Amino acid sequence: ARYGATSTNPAKSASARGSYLRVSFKNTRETAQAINGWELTKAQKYLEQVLDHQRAIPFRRFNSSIGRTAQGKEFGVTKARWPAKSVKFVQGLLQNAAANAEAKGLDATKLYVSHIQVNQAPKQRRRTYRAHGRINKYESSPSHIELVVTEKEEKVVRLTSRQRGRIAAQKRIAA
Amino acid sequence: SEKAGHQTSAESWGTGRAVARIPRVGGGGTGRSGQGAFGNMCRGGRMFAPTK
Amino acid sequence: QNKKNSITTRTLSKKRAKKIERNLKYATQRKLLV
Amino acid sequence: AKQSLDVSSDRRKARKAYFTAPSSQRRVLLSAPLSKELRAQYGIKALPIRRDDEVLVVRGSKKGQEGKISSVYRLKFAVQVDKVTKEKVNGASVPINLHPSKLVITKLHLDKDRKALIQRKGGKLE
Amino acid sequence: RSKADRMAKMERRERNRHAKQGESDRHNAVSLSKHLFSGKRGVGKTDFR
RNA sequence: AUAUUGGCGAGAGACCGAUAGCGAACAAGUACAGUGAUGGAAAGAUGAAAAGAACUUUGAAAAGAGAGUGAAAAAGUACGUGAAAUUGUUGAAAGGGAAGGGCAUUUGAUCAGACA
RNA sequence: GUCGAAUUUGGGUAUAGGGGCGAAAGACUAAUCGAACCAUCUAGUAGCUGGUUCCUGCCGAAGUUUCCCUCAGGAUAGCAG
RNA sequence: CGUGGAGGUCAGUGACGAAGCCUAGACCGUAAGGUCGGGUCGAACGGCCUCUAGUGCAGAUCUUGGUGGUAGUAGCAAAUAUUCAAAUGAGAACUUUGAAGACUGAAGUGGGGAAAGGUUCCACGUCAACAGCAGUUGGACGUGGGUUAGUCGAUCCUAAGA
Ligand SMILES: [Mg+2]
Ligand SMILES: [Mg+2]
Ligand SMILES: [Mg+2]
Ligand SMILES: [Mg+2]
Ligand SMILES: [Mg+2]
Ligand SMILES: [Mg+2]
Ligand SMILES: [Mg+2]
Ligand SMILES: [Mg+2]
Ligand SMILES: [Mg+2]
Ligand SMILES: [Mg+2]
Ligand SMILES: [Mg+2]
Ligand SMILES: [Mg+2]
Ligand SMILES: [Mg+2]
Ligand SMILES: [Mg+2]
Ligand SMILES: [Mg+2]
Ligand SMILES: [Mg+2]
Ligand SMILES: [Mg+2]
Ligand SMILES: [Mg+2]
Ligand SMILES: [Mg+2]
Ligand SMILES: [Mg+2]
């Protein structure tokens, strides 16, 4: 429990989450944003194509000195990548959310990703030895990922006396 | 206690060392090594004007 | 709203809901006594 | 107000003595008052609780339940009664930890030393 | 047995986040290395190349 | 009759309240470091009671979702409260080589008093 | 560069800090040598640098005089209460 | 004006919610600050008259702890070199077997020892952490097994020395 945002009418929604996952937070944020708001089956097929390198995850925020590719033109960008580990974690959470929706009895062809959210888990703090006898940090940035899929469903005016008289006179002048 | 904050073997690393000149704990192999000591502004140091 | 009967961040905890129920019973007892 | 110089009103010392009392001291610390019937019958008010005496719960959610003491768990300052349990769906029964100050003894387990203790406290049995 | 196993697995988490080799990895890093923070190199001999 | 920062046993405080108070409230002169003499940390708080989440379902599993225990899981052995820096999502807004501030008003949003 | 000797090297042993050892470079003496390392006296010494924590009200200065021979460091006088 | 503690009082506040914290809400002070509403929270706390002080921070290349941008960036390019199939497994560039190509080239990338280390040896189980990619593998994790002397050494002798 305690998601970042909940759905009103929880009977038409399913949720999934995964915490302390040893996967890059920046890549996972890009993947989740690339998936945000889509229909569930379309999102799953898109992630399969990303794994097959036929389509790409556009990289919008954490994208300094990334290479350029022609597959970002689908989303009006030049910088996109294919983060396999992030795609696999998000695929696992999508499969779990679909299973939870099926257990609830929701129509699986009307489900869309109404909420998805990645934030930073506590860091994995390895260290390396460096020149002149130094110790430098060597850290993994893990993710907390959560998502909610939702079944998509298809004035007194105050007038002054002058205004009231004007309206009455217009009414008398007209029909 | 009149010995509180004084049971420490610490010395200043000198001027021009890119760090503050507060005395620092010597030795090695523990997190205490290199930490400031003896100061009233220092964690674990002696209080200003200890009560008598 | 839950007594009468998208994505939101407004939730009611069970702790607070039980406290509201208890306080409402207090107020209703006062109303019946007056 | 205390008058002896050999007794301490220090809260820290009292709490340390309570939480580090040995088993024989905890036996005295775990005392239960008698029922009204037993108090009239024996002429004493409270006794240390032991394994085979029957009790009535007079405080808490289990108030009114009767049973026989199942154990005196002195290590956790509690007693266990056989009939007072928390039950689960899978068939698990966990004894409720009751404090003897919240219990009332309705029937004493009487042996030679118990009779001697009652008499030396001032009892009038038989 | 499974209860104690879960207790041990839960207790392992902080050391595993600090990436210790096990219970036996108890390396302690100093706060400041004097040979790294005592550099004042005049015209002459230095302490490193 | 006087001394007493050691030892044993006691009683107290307008003292400190976990970066404080002894270095040490905890398996602390420990862990760790150093050939050695020596140097020397960090680290307290689920709950009244472990009742510490049975059972079902998805997953290779960690786990998730239902369910359940409990006053509370906005207490899940990462556990009382749970600030700031810093971060994610949502909503609103601004942006032609910084931003922030003062006076004044427009626009949008939002709101208290006074109403016999 | 030198490579069969003033050669290279293991182990044992001896020499210890105002001392040793030195085919002499103030070289080396456990990453420490114009003085090894460790603890204590010890919170050692300041001509100097840096910092020094709430508000408002009212009053509000000082480089101009004589001296200790003159630097330095002090005294007096002046100004504000 | 504000803070820790202390004497007195308000027979003060409080499980119908104390303190703390958050707040697009309200008010009083020139101000230091004070007061009220909502949320969160779960057991103590304040007004006034006085006492007392380890009593108020933006700085000190301040102390301790925590966190950013840099940045998914620099980089993971010495030691010629890997490939195919099957098996195992959820998952195989990295495990195992077979099939190949190479290399050390006897001053070895072979076979033993001394110093040092101390169980790392071997078997079974086994993957959270570690092996700067990976991992079903391991000098890793868990549980055990293993070192047999009249003849090999110490032990005995003496060397410089103590
Ligand atoms: Mg580049
Ligand atoms: Mg090195
Ligand atoms: Mg101290
Ligand atoms: Mg301490
Ligand atoms: Mg908490
Ligand atoms: Mg913040
Ligand atoms: Mg531009
Ligand atoms: Mg020659
Ligand atoms: Mg409150
Ligand atoms: Mg102070
Ligand atoms: Mg500050
Ligand atoms: Mg300042
Ligand atoms: Mg600084
Ligand atoms: Mg690169
Ligand atoms: Mg190579
Ligand atoms: Mg060859
Ligand atoms: Mg061998
Ligand atoms: Mg082996
Ligand atoms: Mg790795
Ligand atoms: Mg082993």
Domain boundaries of chain D, sorted by first residue: 1-126
Which H helix or E strand runs over C21?
Answer: helix C14-33
E49 vs B: CB within 8 A: no
A84/A23 Cα distance (integer angstroms): 10
A39/A97 Cα distance (integer angstroms): 13
D12/E34 Cα distance (integer angstroms): 45
User: Tokens 């024989």 correspond to what residue?
Assistant: D24
Q: Where are the domains of chain A?
A: 9-154
A93/A18 Cα distance (integer angstroms): 7
Considering only the beta carbons, identify the residue of A125, A132, A135 that sits closest to E19.
Answer: A125
A81/A38 Cα distance (integer angstroms): 19
* CATH architecture type of domain D1-126: Roll (2.30)
Tokens coding A152: 């998509």
Determine contact, residues D98/D61, Cβ cutoff 8 Å. Answer: no
CA B20 → CA A32, A76, B30, distances in Å? Answer: 46, 52, 20
E30/A121 Cα distance (integer angstroms): 26
A141/A20 Cα distance (integer angstroms): 9
3-state per-residue secondary structure call for chain A: CCCCCEECCHHHEEEEEEEEECCCHHHHHHHHHHHCCCEHHHHHHHHHHHHCCCCCEECCCCCCCCCCCHHHHHHCCCCEECCHHHHHHHHHHHHHHHHHHHHHCCCCCCEEEEEEEEEECCCEEEEEEECCCEEEEEEECCEEEEEEEEECCCCCCCCCHHHHHHHHHHHHHCC
Which residue type does A23 have? Answer: V
User: Tokens 């030895």 correspond to what residue?
Assistant: A129
For residue A127, which residues of chain E lie inside 8 Å, CB to CB?
19, 29
Tokens coding D22: 């040995």
Which of A11, A15, A8 lies closest to A117 in space, CA to CA? A15
Per DSSP bridges, beta strands D66-73 and D54-57 are antiparallel
E43 vs A: CB within 8 A: no
CA E1 → CA B1, C5, D40, D73, E16, distances in Å? Answer: 50, 48, 51, 24, 22
B43 vs E: CB within 8 A: no
C6/A114 Cβ within 8 A = yes
- Nearest chain E residue to A141 by CA distance is E17
A124/E17 Cβ within 8 A = yes
